[PDB]
Structures are given as structure tokens and as C-alpha cells.
Amino acid sequence: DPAAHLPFFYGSISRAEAEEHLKLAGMADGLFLLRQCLRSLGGYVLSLVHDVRFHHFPIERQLNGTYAIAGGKAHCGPAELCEFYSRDPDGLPCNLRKPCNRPSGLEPQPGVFDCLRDAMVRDYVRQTWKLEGEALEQAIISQAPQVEKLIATTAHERMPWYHSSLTREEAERKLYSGAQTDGKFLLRPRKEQGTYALSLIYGKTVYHYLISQDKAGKYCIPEGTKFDTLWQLVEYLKLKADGLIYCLKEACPN
């Protein structure tokens, strides 16, 4: 990760954890930290304090490898972006003053998605090129970036909560037939390609939410947060309801 060496990069942490660190640091204006985006591939989130209030700016990695905040100037990397904004606010509520450096003994938190994608890329390369040992190791380094998107967009298909073929009726039959604990969910594809449904049980009642991908290829429940992959959507909604009646808890297996 291009930002792993930055003392103010916290890795894959939540907004809550990020705000906790900024609070414990004094809540000074311009105080900021960088964390890995939980919604996009290779993105970051700039978290800063101003007027005793938190501001979170998602940083997207452009196709050409640069990084930029929505409507902002692109930069060749996360460090250069923070350096630029230290000098010129250029749209932010205030310039970046004083990085919230990681406390001694605290390292950046590894992302679960990155960790799982590693295994998947290895397996894909091994099955396709029939390589092993150092040979496999060299190949994964050479192929990883090229097959990255492919593995990420299809990662959901390997998760327990994904059901390749379930109608609304069958989905309800599975959710109702069990412990019926709040947050029990499953993801299923719909007839029209590009659309899926999130079905969860809350208060002995099953809710179904439509998920569709826009022209940009991003997924979302109508009027909701957008994600690069279905895996990220589900994982995000496990942390916060973000509009849902209740957040995702237990996965309803195969």
C-alpha cells in the first residue's frame, strides 16, 4: 500500500475509530489522518477536524493511477495529496495542519478485503498458469494488478452469504426457517443482470432491498452509498445500517 509508510495512515479502520483518535489528540483545527477506503478499490479517506467538527473526504484512485478528492486536483499519490493540501486548502474547510500520527506501538490496520483478495489472486494464478513455488510468487507479482478488478468484483461468489440461485420466496423460506435472529441476511442475484437483492430478517419480518449497478459500474441500494464491489457493500453494511432497517449480522449460509 503506497500509504503504509505514512505515520498518519491508520489503514483499514472505521469512521468511528478514526474520530476516536482525532478526539484523543486534542481536536485541533487542521488535525488530520488518512485511512483506507472501505468502499472503493485502492481509495483512501482523509479525515480532518475543523471547528470541533469532523470532515471525511473520500479519495478515489483514478484509472491513470492518480488520486483525487471529488472535484479536486489529481495527485500522483496519497502523500503528495496531503502535502498539497497543507499549503493550499483548495476547497477544504481549512488547510491540513498537524498530522495525527499513529501512537507508538500502533501500526496500520490490515484490511480484510485485501487479505482475502491475496488468497484469491494466488489461487487464480496457480490454476491458470499451473505454477508453484518461487515461479508462482513471481507470476502473482506480475499478474496481480491485471487480474485485480476481476478477482475483486467476483469475490462475493465465494462468501457463505451469497446464494447463486434463490427466488424471493425461497429466500424468505430460508430466513424464516431458523433462529430468526435480527440481522440474519443473504444476498441473491435477480433475473435482470446487474440487479441483486439483499434480504434480511428483523423483528420476525423479512426486508428486501434492491441493489443495482450504475453506468460507472458502482453498486448501490437506490439513493444509498456506492461501492466498487458487492463484497464491500455487504461488509460496510455490517458496520453501519446506512439506511437499512438494521445492520447485517449473521450470514444465512448456502
Partner: peptide
């Protein structure tokens, strides 16, 4: 299409953008 539930827009997580 069918009877799908809507998001309670009042509980959505807000992200900032440049002004």
C-alpha cells in the same frame, strides 16, 4: 421488480465534498 424496502435517508452516512 416487486415490493422492495426503501432506505431511511435520515440515517445515511454523510461524506464531505469540496466547495
Amino acid at each position: 421488480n416487486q415490493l422492495y424496502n426503501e432506505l431511511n435517508l435520515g440515517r445515511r452516512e454523510e461524506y464531505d465534498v469540496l466547495d
